[PDB]
Amino acid sequence: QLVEQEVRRLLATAAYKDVVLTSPKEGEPWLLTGYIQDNHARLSLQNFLESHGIPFRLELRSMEELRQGAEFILQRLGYHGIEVSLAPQAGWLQLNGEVSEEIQKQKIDSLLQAEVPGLLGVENKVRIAPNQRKRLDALLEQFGLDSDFTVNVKGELIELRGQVNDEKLSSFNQLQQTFRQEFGNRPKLELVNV
């Protein structure tokens, strides 16, 4: 009837495009479920329902609250290079940025779903970050230096330890030039005579 028609006209607007109304029977509250873009939109719908003398229950989630939740979870789990935005589907988020190969294996999309209530899915567009260790070892092997130098990693400081002679010093200098051209100033390679 009329009031239901008025409510459904509001639900046909873009702010309420992810809200569902299940009509009650006699004497039960009207049930509205789904998603809204932010809490402000929820409050406006509440206002509208109350002005029609409608008894109701809202079971709605804010996409901005899902997005902020996901940001908090990524932060507390030590992920720093990831930006969270909305995906095209209701209840879905999107990730951009970069992570290491090892960390990608943690299946962060499903992990975010476990940690963020009402998250229906994640479109994960992050790329794989530079793997400096892997490239260093590839270069050492490519140049026949992998038995001359031993790699010791402490944070972003990588020591190449060996019994340094003139050959090894000049080979190190070439390796370091090549490494720097690709990675800039992180991590740093130090030559260490032992």
Author numbering: 154 to 347
Authors' own words:
acts as a connector between the secretin and the IM (YscD, PrgH, MxiG). YscD is known to have four periplasmic domains.
* indicates the junction between YscC and YscD. to Y. enterocolitica injectisomes by YscC and YscD. about the interaction between the YscD and YscJ protomers. YscD units would lead to a poorer match with the experimental data. the YscJ 24-mer further supports the proposed stoichiometry. forcing a preferential perpendicular orientation to the IM. confirming the preferential orientation found in the 24-mer YscD ring assembly. YscDJ ring modeling has been performed to test for any elasticity of the basal body.
